[PDB]
Structure 1
Amino acid sequence: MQAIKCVVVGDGAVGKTCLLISYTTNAFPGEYIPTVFDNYSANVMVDGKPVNLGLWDTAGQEDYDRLRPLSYPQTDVFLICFSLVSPASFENVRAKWYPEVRHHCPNTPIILVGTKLDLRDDKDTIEKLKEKKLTPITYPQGLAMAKEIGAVKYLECSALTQRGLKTVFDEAIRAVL
């Protein structure tokens, strides 16, 4: 049966740990958002071909430019993530994440994931951004970023509502088979 290593990269602002917990538990953790997601594997069926899906978090390593790549070798697929309501996180896809992922894993499929879809239409979030002369990241911006980095897919998801979340990981698997 096919083993798949999937590494999740991107800024603190994406909610990497929360994404992976909400995916694996089928629930936003809500009360307390744990800081620890330990390396994970689980059998899932995709296009009726059962697969062993491995998920590695990278939360905590955002400031250690030479420690992060220690997880990179023999990865089957990267999720490169940004928060739809952090323009900075989106620019860092271009500035930080894609370069080091290409440098170390030139021929590895990348899925571009915009997280916090539920906050893109939120008055307080929208207003907080307007005060910094910014707006949320819209769909065509993600598509255009995906194209630029060689992403096989751009996908939007919420850990909160579970909207697009299962699809993210289905597509991670599909990008490998």
Structure 2
Amino acid sequence: PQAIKCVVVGDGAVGKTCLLISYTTNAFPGEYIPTVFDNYSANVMVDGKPVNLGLWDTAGQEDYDRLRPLSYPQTDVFLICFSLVSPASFENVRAKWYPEVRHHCPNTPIILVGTKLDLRDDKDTIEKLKEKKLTPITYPQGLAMAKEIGAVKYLECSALTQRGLKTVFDEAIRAV
């Protein structure tokens, strides 16, 4: 069984922990657990091959910028995440995450992941964003960003409904 180390980064509250817990436990977290540093694991079968997937959960706040790189050594694949209903978190993929990952790991494959997919069709969420003169990020925008930063894949998912969730990690694994 191949051991694959996958590190997840992105702005605070984009859904990194929910995405990882929903995948590893098959259930959306029952409550919010702040993340400073953590790691989970899962034994999965991809293309008929057993894999021991090591998942690294990080803190998106800048106050922990000096801590995040401690999770990077020997990383096999990176998941850079942004919330599809937070244009600001999307802009940070370009302004912060892509640069940080590349600065530390210039040759590691990156999967760009749009999170909270279910909210893009959520009436109340759409309404609240409009009051702020904002709109959810569209699939095309995300795809273009993925190409801009050289991501091997652009994937969207919902940790809540689990739509597109399994594919995120199958592809992360297939990228190694």
TM-score (normalizing by structure 2): 0.93
1:130-174 residue CA offsets vs partner (Å, 9 max, x unmatched):
111110001000000000010000000001100000110111100
Q: Distance in 1 between matches of 2:94 and 2:35?
A: 26
**Partner residue, 1:93:** 93
Deviates more, 1:124-133 or 1:85-94: 124-133
1:15-41 residue CA offsets vs partner (Å, 9 max, x unmatched):
111111111111112455675884222
1:50-77 residue CA offsets vs partner (Å, 9 max, x unmatched):
1111001003654222221121121000
- Check conservation: 2:59, 2:68, Cα contact below 8 A: no
- Check conservation: 2:10, 2:60, Cα contact below 8 A: no
Q: Distance in 1 between matches of 2:168 and 2:26?
A: 13
Deviates more, 1:36-45 or 1:9-18: 36-45
**Could you tell me the percent identity over the aligned residues?**
100
TM-score (normalizing by structure 1): 0.93
Number of equivalent positions = 175
Moved over 4 A (4+): 31-37
- Check conservation: 1:116, 1:158, Cα contact below 8 A: yes
1:113-137 residue CA offsets vs partner (Å, 9 max, x unmatched):
0000010011111111111111000
**Partner residue, 2:151:** 151
Q: Distance in 1 between matches of 2:86 and 2:80?
A: 14
Unaligned runs of 5+ in 2: none
Q: 1:33 to 1:64 in 2, by over 3 A?
A: closer
- Check conservation: 2:9, 2:60, Cα contact below 8 A: no
- Check conservation: 1:110, 1:152, Cα contact below 8 A: yes
Q: 1:106 to 1:32 in 2, by over 3 A?
A: closer
Q: Distance in 2 between matches of 1:92 and 1:61?
A: 12
Q: 1:42 to 1:31 in 2, by over 3 A?
A: closer
Q: CA RMSD in A?
A: 1.7
- Check conservation: 1:16, 1:59, Cα contact below 8 A: no
Q: 1:60 to 1:115 in 2, by over 3 A?
A: closer
- Check conservation: 1:17, 1:59, Cα contact below 8 A: no
Q: What secondary structure sits across from 1:38 in the alignment?
A: strand
- Check conservation: 1:113, 1:155, Cα contact below 8 A: yes
Q: What secondary structure sits across from 1:101 in the alignment?
A: helix
**Partner residue, 2:40:** 40
Q: Please state which structure has a larger fraction of its residues in strand.
A: 2
Q: 1:31 to 1:115 in 2, by over 3 A?
A: same
Q: 1:124 to 1:91 in 2, by over 3 A?
A: same
